[PDB]
Amino acid sequence: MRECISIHVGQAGVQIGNACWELYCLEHGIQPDGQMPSDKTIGGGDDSFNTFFSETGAGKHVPRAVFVDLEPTVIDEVRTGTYRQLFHPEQLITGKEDAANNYARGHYTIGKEIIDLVLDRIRKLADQCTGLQGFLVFHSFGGGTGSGFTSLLMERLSVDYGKKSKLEFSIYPAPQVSTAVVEPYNSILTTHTTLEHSDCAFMVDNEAIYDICRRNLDIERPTYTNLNRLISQIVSSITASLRFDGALNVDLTEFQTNLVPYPRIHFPLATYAPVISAEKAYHEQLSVAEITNACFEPANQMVKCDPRHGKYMACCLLYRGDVVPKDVNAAIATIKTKRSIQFVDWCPTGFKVGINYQPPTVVPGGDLAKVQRAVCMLSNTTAIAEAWARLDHKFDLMYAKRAFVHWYVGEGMEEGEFSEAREDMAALEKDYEEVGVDSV
C-alpha cells in the first residue's frame, strides 16, 4: 500500500495542517479520537487508508505527520484542541525560542538542537511503510522556520532518502501584502537550497485567495481558517488517486515528470475553480466546461500573476466527481481554440488529465458548497518570472545598504551567502526568458 509522509513547518504549515487532517478524517470516516465507526458497516475492507493513516490492532488510526514549529504556541493548541487524541504525542514543540523571522536561526543556530529529533521521528515513520512514494512539506516562503528549517530538512532527506519525491506547498510572498520586512531575503535564501533538492513546489498567495473569497464566496472579512480549507481541498485533489478509485489515476511521480521540463523550473501555480457558496450553488450547473474555463481565468488563480504576461508550459487538471472524459476532451479543445492561452512551441500537447470518482467533502463551519464535481489546475508558467523579478528588486535595494543583515550574521551567516543566493536567482530569470524564446 502507498505511503506519503506529510511534514508541516511553522505557523503557516502547522495551521494549514489543521485543515488537511480535519478534511481527511472526514473523507475516511475517522473521528478526532482516532476511532472509526464506519467499520461496523462492513467489518473489514480498507476504508482506512495507509497513505495517510497507520492502524493499530485496537481500532485506532494515526496520521503519518510530523509538526515541527521551534515554538510551542501552535502545537500546544493541538495538544489541547479537538485533535489531541489523534496525533502521536511526538509533535516536535522543542522551541525554547522561535527563528525571529531569520533564516540564520531556523537553519543552523536554532534549527540544530531539533532536526535530529525530526529525522529520527521521520526514520520511525518510513520503517512502518512498505511502498513509500513521496514527501509533502507544507511551509511558508518568508518566515524563519519555514525558510531555513525546510531547507536544512530537505538537504538531509535528499541525503538519507534520495530517490524520493519531495513536493512543497509554500505561501508565496505577495507583491503588495506582506507581514514582515525580511520576507524577500528569506525567500531568496530558501530557494537557493531547495531548488537543488525539491521536485515540485506548489505556490499559493494569500492576496489571491482573499480576492477569491471576496468575489466568489462573498466573504468581505476573510481569515486564514477559510483559506487553509481551500488548500486542504487542493492537497485532497492531489492525494486522491492514492486513496480512491478512478479512471485516470495519477501517482505522485507523475507531477514530477509531466510538469518539470528542466530541474530548476518546478514552481507551478494552483487553482480550484468551483469556489462557490450555497447561495450560488444554484444558478449554476457546474459542468466541466465552465470549470476548465474558470481555471484559466486570470482571477481564479490562487497566486497573483497574470498568465497573459507569459506562456504556459505544462498543465495538470485533476478532476474529481462525476466526470466523463468526453467533457474534458471538449473542454481542452475549447482552450486551444482560444488565443489568450498561449503555449510554448515545444509542447503541443501541453495538458494532463486525471479523473477520480470520489467527490470533495464539505466541512461543517465551511464556506464552500456541496458539488458533484470539482477540479484542481496546477500549471507551470513563465508569468512567475515577473514575481521572481519583483522579489529580486526588493532584495536589491535593502542589500544595497546592508539592512537587517547583522541579525543574520549574528546567528551564523556570511555576507557572500546573500550575494551567492542572489546570483542563483538572476540565473533562474534567464532560464525562463530562455524557455520563452521560440524555436528556429
Binding site: 505557523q11 495551521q15 515554538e71 510551542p72 504556541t73 501552535v74 500546544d76 493548541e77 525554547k96 525560542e97 522561535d98 525571529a100 523571522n101 531569520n102 503588495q176 501584502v177 506582506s178 507581514t179 514582515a180 520586512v181 525580511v182 520576507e183 524577500p184 494569500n206 492576496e207 482573499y210 473569497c213 472579512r221 476573510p222 481569515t223 486564514y224 526588493k394 535595494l397 535593502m398 544595497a400 545598504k401 539592512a403 537587517f404 547583522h406 541579525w407
Partner: protein, 431 residues
C-alpha cells in the same frame, strides 16, 4: 517557555510597574494574595513569562526593585498589589542619587548593583529558557538613568544573547522637572544606544495631550498616564502569553524594526483610547484603530511623525479579526502616505494578531514606530547640553563624584552621530 525578568528603577519605574503588575494580573486572574481566581484556562498556560510558581498555587512576579531611596519601596508595600512581590527582591538604599547620574552609576549605585545582580542571577537561572530583560526607568532623575544603565551594561556583559527592551520616560520640550535632564539623558543615551535592542521612548507631555484631547480627562494623575504605558508594555508580550493567527515576539519585532543596530528608539502607541461618553458613538473596527494609531495625536514620544519618515512600523493586534482587513489597511497607509515612509524598504509595516483580547474590549491594538522625528528629541538635548557645558554650570557635582569632561564630550558626539543617522533617511527625494 519564554521568560522575562522585569526590573524597575526609580520613582517612574516603580510607579509604572506598580500599575503593570496590576494589569497583567487582571489579564491572568491573579489576586493580591498571588492566588488564581480566573475563569478561562489560557492564562495559566503561559503565565511563566512574568510569574513564578510557589507552594500553595501562588504566583510571585519576577520583580527586581532597586529604587535608590526607601520611600518608593514603602509605597509599593503599603499599596494595592504589594503582597505578592518577593520580600528578598525589594532591594534599596538611603539618600538617593540627588538627581545626579554619577551617584547612581559610580558612587552610590556601585554599592548596590551587586546586590541586584544577586537577584537577577537568582531569577534568571530559575528559567528553562529566557527571552530577555524588561527595564522601566526614567531619563532625567539620576538613579533610573545611572543605576539603570550600569545594570544594563552588566547584564549585556553576562547575558549578551538576550533582549534588553527598555521603557524610558524622556524629558519633555516645553517644561522640565529637573534642571539636569539634558546631561543625564545624554549620558544615559550613550549607555543605552550601545547596550539595547528595542528602546521605547515615552514622554509625559504627549500623555497629557492624549488625556486632554481623546479621553477628555482634565485631572489626570500619573496613575492615568502609567495606565497607558502598561497597556503598550502588555501588548508587546501578548503573542508570548496567548495564542494567535500570526505570532511575534521581542526578537521578531526587533529583527523587523532595527535595520541598523542603533535605530532602536521607537514611538509607542495604543488603541482604542476613548472618552467615557463618546464610546456609544463609534464602531470598534480595524479602520478606526488604524486611523487612531497612525495619528500624530496618539503618539507618546513628543515628536510629530509628519516631520519625518517612518522607517519601520509595527502593529500588535488583539482580538478576533480578519487578516485581510489588517493587510489592506496597512497597505492603504503605505500607499496614501508614501512620503511619510521610506522608499528603499518596500513593506514598512509588520502585523501580528492574537485571539485573546483585554478584559473589556472586543479587540485592541498596539503600535511601535521607528521614525526620524525622534532626532528632534535628541537635537533639543544636545542644544541644551552644549549650552550648559559651554559654561560648566552644574558640573562640580558630577566631577566631585569621579567624572571627566570627556564622558560628556563622548556622549554629546554620539547623540549628534545618531541625529545624522536618522537624518540620512529624512530627505524628500525620488528614485
Amino acid at each position: 517557555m519564554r521568560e522575562i525578568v522585569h526590573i524597575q528603577a526609580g520613582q517612574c519605574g516603580n510607579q509604572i510597574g506598580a500599575k503593570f503588575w496590576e494589569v497583567i494580573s487582571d489579564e491572568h486572574g491573579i489576586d493580591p494574595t498571588g492566588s488564581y481566581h480566573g475563569d478561562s484556562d489560557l492564562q495559566l498556560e503561559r503565565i511563566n513569562v512574568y510569574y513564578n510558581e510557589a507552594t500553595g498555587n501562588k504566583y510571585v512576579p519576577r520583580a527586581i526593585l532597586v529604587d535608590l531611596e526607601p520611600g518608593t519601596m514603602d509605597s509599593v508595600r503599603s499599596g494595592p498589589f504589594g503582597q505578592i512581590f518577593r520580600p528578598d527582591n525589594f532591594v534599596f538604599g538611603q539618600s538617593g542619587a540627588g538627581n545626579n547620574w554619577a551617584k547612581g552609576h559610580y558612587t552610590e549605585g556601585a554599592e548596590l548593583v551587586d546586590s541586584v545582580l544577586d537577584v537577577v542571577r537568582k531569577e534568571s537561572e530559575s528559567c528553562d529558557c529566557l527571552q530577555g530583560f524588561q527595564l522601566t526607568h526614567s531619563l532625567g532623575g539620576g538613579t533610573g538613568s545611572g543605576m539603570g544603565t550600569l545594570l544594563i551594561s552588566k547584564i549585556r556583559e553576562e547575558y549578551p544573547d538576550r533582549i534588553m527592551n527598555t521603557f524610558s520616560v524622556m524629558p519633555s520640550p516645553k517644561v522640565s522637572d529637573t534642571v539636569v535632564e539634558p546631561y543625564n539623558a545624554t549620558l544615559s543615551v550613550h549607555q543605552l544606544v550601545e547596550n539595547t535592542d528595542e528602546t521605547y521612548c515615552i514622554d509625559n507631555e504627549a500623555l497629557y495631550d492624549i488625556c486632554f484631547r481623546t479621553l477628555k480627562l482634565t485631572t489626570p494623575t500619573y496613575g492615568d498616564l502609567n495606565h497607558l504605558v502598561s497597556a503598550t508594555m502588555s501588548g508587546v508580550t501578548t503573542c508570548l502569553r496567548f495564542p494567535g493567527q500570526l505570532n511575534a515576539d521581542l526578537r521578531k519585532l526587533a529583527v523587523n524594526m532595527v535595520p541598523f543596530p542603533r535605530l532602536h528608539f521607537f514611538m509607542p502607541g495604543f488603541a482604542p483610547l476613548t472618552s467615557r461618553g463618546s464610546q456609544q458613538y463609534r464602531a470598534l473596527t480595524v479602520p478606526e484603530l488604524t486611523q487612531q494609531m497612525f495619528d500624530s495625536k496618539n503618539m507618546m514620544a513628543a515628536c510629530d511623525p509628519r516631520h519625518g519618515r517612518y522607517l519601520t512600523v509595527a502593529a500588535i493586534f488583539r482580538g478576533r479579526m480578519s487578516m485581510k482587513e489588517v493587510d489592506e489597511q496597512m497597505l492603504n497607509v503605505q500607499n496614501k502616505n508614501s512620503s511619510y515612509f521610506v522608499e528603499w524598504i518596500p513593506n514598512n509595516v509588520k502585523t501580528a494578531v492574537c485571539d485573546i483580547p483585554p478584559r473589556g474590549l472586543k479587540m485592541s491594538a498596539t503600535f511601535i514606530g521607528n521614525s526620524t522625528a525622534i532626532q528632534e528629541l535628541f537635537k533639543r538635548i544636545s542644544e541644551q547640553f552644549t549650552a550648559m557645558f559651554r559654561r560648566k554650570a552644574f558640573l562640580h557635582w558630577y566631577t566631585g563624584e569621579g567624572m571627566d569632561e570627556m564622558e560628556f564630550t563622548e556622549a554629546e558626539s554620539n547623540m549628534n552621530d545618531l541625529v545624522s543617522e536618522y537624518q540620512q533617511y529624512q530627505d524628500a527625494t525620488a528614485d
